[PDB]
Amino acid sequence: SHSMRYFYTSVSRPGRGEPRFIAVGYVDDTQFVRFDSDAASQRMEPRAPWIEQEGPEYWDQETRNVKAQSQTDRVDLGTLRGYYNQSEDGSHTIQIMYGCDVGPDGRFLRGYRQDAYDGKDYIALNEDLRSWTAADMAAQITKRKWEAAHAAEQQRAYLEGRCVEWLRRYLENGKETLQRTDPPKTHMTHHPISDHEATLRCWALGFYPAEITLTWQRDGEDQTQDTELVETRPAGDGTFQKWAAVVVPSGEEQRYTCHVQHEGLPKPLTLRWEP
Amino acid sequence: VVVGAGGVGK
């Protein structure tokens, strides 16, 4: 079970010039393309090994389609500045995420297309891929245009057609990478916070994909009281890192146990403090 | 592959 997602981001810099558009694309937790309006290149660019192999026709198509998008987005910044009657002093920010989801059988599960302005829902396409949800009045106008232009019929044709055809090609092409499970390599650390309390941190490193569940147990029983989780973070090599901590009474370290569930673990893992 | 650019703006 896997996904493709594009993330477009377009920022106004009134005076400093034309908007900065930046597009990136993902298959599961792995980036594979990018476009930056300010780059020398002026091309959609590879960012995984397994896409480099697409031919010049692919790169040209992807380049032009995405330039065409950056251009719409550029106009859209001024149309929305006009909807909200904001002055042309301020930097504003359209962001679009869309993509699809296939099951292990390789068939369509869901599609997505969601736009926002200044960091807040603007307009979304519903799971019906046939109707939109405006968040405010500006979006309600967009919504009439897109109802008449039949925009939804366009997204749907993409998300149920070319999005999955190509997600599937990318998973075959990248199978040694995109379908690897890398299990988490786990240690535990101990930080006396006081003469009475101490912090057990449970570490998980080098794992892919990023989906992972770290829980604590005391004397063999669910424990969430006094527990932290960090935001899962990237290693830079295409793998993930995340820790979980609990504050415990000193002397009582040996009753707590870190539990680790990840896709590439046949059995869940288990750590205990060892001094 | 990216979606085609929309036929109308916002």
């Epitope: 330039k67 251009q71 106009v75 | -």
Partner: T-cell receptor, first 117, second 117 residues
Framework: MNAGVTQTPKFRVLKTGQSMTLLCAQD?????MYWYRQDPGMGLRLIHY???????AKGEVPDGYNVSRLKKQNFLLGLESAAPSQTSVYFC??????????????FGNGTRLTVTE | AQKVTQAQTEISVVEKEDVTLDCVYE???????LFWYKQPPSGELVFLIR??????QNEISGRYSWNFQKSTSSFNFTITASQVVDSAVYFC??????????????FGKGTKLSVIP
Amino acid sequence: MNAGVTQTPKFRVLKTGQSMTLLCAQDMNHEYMYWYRQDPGMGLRLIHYSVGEGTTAKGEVPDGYNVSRLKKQNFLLGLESAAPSQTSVYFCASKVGPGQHNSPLHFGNGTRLTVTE
Amino acid sequence: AQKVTQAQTEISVVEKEDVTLDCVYETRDTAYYLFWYKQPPSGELVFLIRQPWWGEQNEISGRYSWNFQKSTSSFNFTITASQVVDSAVYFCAMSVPSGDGSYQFTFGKGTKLSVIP
């Protein structure tokens, strides 16, 4: 509500080597504008075009023609040196731009030019 | 590799009768719009319809119907109850994103329809 695309002149006859400017204005705030010729058996050939004020680009049959997009409003076609080859029907055209990628071309009515020895 | 082909130069049908105007496109681009234009004796060029790549097959619009077949790259125009008025030159066309992202056009060479009393 809107005039659309206006072209001047409508008829004109040069002598070979004389010069002239066909003028085209559009009142619809379009970003792209175009200059086509139209000949028996060839249909519609683009001469030059412009995606924006200040900029212009060579089309399919530029040689013999210059253009200026000084203002968004108008797009000028200049014949510096009239050839009989350029005897034709010239058609100005505009298109909204990236606010509406699906926009069709809007054409004017056409200038009928005859260049003679 | 953008061509549009109309293939019929010239077609003639008696009034109160169906006529279909064949049009075939060739592109490798996936985000195209196809168009039809009408050019009566007067010369001016009138937008009729746009079918986009993602579109449904049929599109009715008064006496005018069109039939989009992506598998075989044909976009044929039918007229029911042909009236001499319909006599004209009819132009199939197509737009794709160009280098800078701006949509730009490729025209067939035209079919000449004579509807005779």
